[PDB]
Amino acid sequence: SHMAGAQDFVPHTADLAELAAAAGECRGCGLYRDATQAVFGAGGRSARIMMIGEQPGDKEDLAGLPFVGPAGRLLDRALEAADIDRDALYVTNAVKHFKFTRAAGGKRRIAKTPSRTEVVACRPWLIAEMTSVEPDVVVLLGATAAKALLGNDFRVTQHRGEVLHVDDVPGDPALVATVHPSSLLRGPKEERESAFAGLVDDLRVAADVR
Numbered sequence: 001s002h003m004a005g006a007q008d009f010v011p012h013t014a015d016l017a018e019l020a021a022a023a024g025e026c027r028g029c030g031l032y033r034d035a036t037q038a039v040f041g042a043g044g045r046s047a048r049i050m051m052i053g054e055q056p057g058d059k060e061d062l063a064g065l066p067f068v069g070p071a072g073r074l075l076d077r078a079l080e081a082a083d084i085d086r087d088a089l090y091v092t093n094a095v096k097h098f099k100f101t102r103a104a105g106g107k108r109r110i111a112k113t114p115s116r117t118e119v120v121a122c123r124p125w126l127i128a129e130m131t132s133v134e135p136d137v138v139v140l141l142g143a144t145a146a147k148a149l150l151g152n153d154f155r156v157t158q159h160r161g162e163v164l165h166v167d168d169v170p171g172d173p174a175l176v177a178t179v180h181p182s183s184l185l186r187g188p189k190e191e192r193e194s195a196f197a198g199l200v201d202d203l204r205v206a207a208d209v210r
């Protein structure tokens with residue numbers, strides 16, 4: 001069967017503060033139990049560009065805000081190269097509770113890919129955030145966020161660098177699917193620098209869309 005997920009837990013408000021506090025009470029999937037807190041979005045409803053990642057990392061889970069670690073610094077590098085003010089954005093994630101595993105002698109917490117069940121469970125919060133902010137443009141950072149709004153069969157590589165519209169997205173924002181900043185953290189340097197430049201292209205396009 002198709003799950004209710006977080007729908008039981010989303011209060012009937014468009015206020016981003018009330019939603020974030022309510023999200024700390026969510027039991028829409030299993031991820032609230034081990035995590036410290038919900039990591040809701042950052043920014044205000046006046047934003048015209050919304051950005052969506054995959055899930056919190058270790059430091060996100062401690063801070064309670066998205067993109068505060070290494071991936072967030074690289075994101076800030078990309079936004080600066082695209083002439084975008086981070087505080088003019090609404091930045092969030094498809095999944096709001098840190099999914100992780102502990103380990104014998106490892107890093108304290110190691111992030112684990114959310115399952116599609118968890119992504120669909122958490123999606124009502126994303127819908128609430130888009131209803132709250134009414135973005136004109138939505139940047140989808142990486143495969144998980146893209147599939148969160150475009151469906152489980154969406155392939156980012158098939159649509160890189162296109163401005164899309166979908167039928168189920170509230171307010172009918174333009175959509176730009178692109179690379180996740182964490183992807184620029186490892187790999188061959190050449191590929192990483194060209195990918196960073198491509199991210200910058202997708203951001204400049206997004207900041208230009210009307």
Ligand SMILES: O=c1cc[nH]c(=O)[nH]1
Nearest residue numbers: 053054055057066067
């Ligand atoms: O906030 C964050 C941090 C790491 N990876 C994501 O997708 N979002």
Ligand code: SF4
Nearest residue numbers: 026028029097121122
């Ligand atoms: S992850 Fe999303 S759905 Fe699962 S419990 Fe936390 S908020 Fe609710």
